[PDB]
Paper text:
To investigate the correlation between mechanical properties and functional efficiency in proteins, we selected neuroglobin (Ngb), a hexacoordinated heme protein, which is expressed in the neurons of vertebrates and is involved in neuroprotection in hypoxic conditions and protects brain from stroke. Ngb folds like all globins with a bundle of eight helices termed A to H, and a heme hexacoordinated in both ferric and ferrous forms by the imidazole side chain of the distal and proximal histidines (His 64 and His 96 respectively). The structures of human and murine Ngb present a large internal cavity behind the heme, that is connected to the surface through a tunnel, forming a pathway toward the heme for gaseous ligands (O2, CO, NO). Like many recently discovered globins, Ngb is characterized by endogenous heme iron hexacoordination in the absence of external ligands.
Author numbering: 3 to 150
The structure:
Amino acid sequence: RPESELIRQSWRVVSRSPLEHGTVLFARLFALEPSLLPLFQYNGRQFSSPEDSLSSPEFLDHIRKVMLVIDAAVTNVEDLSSLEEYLTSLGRKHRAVGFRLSSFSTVGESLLYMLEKSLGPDFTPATRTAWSRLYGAVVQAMSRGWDG
Ligand code: HEM
């Protein structure tokens, strides 16, 4: 597939500094959907402001975890059915923390933003299309965690 290669080459740029790029993803996410902020409940406390999230070591570890799952998806881009069972359970876990299926699109848009900003002119509409498909495949697996 030409899509597989576009994903791998774009990801190489990003995976060089995953927390820096992840931080972009999340900042953007909270700008688009501020109601996602309270779902992170480290020590039974809620962040007041998005910028609070950025000083929390647990929150930053969660960004690293995110980036690691996407990296797994990229590595398995040629066959993502091998991650299906993990992603389903990852879905279920997020369902339990109070994540809602409709917020997947915001996360998607946030991912695309981060890619668009990191790659600049290298973010071609075919790159965009490829990542949307990848992301969509991930969401479809995770969504099975809402079983139905
Ligand atoms: C964007 C909205 C999301 C929110 C609000 C959110 C929230 C959470 C929370 C509250 C936890 C539990 C505490 C912790 O481990 O830090 C968690 C765990 C996790 N999240 Fe997320 N998360 C989101 C998105 C994602 C996405 C898109 C992925 C992966 C692509 C991801 C991967 C993980 C992983 C790997 C864990 C650890 C799960 C476990 O094995 O226990 N998260 N997330």
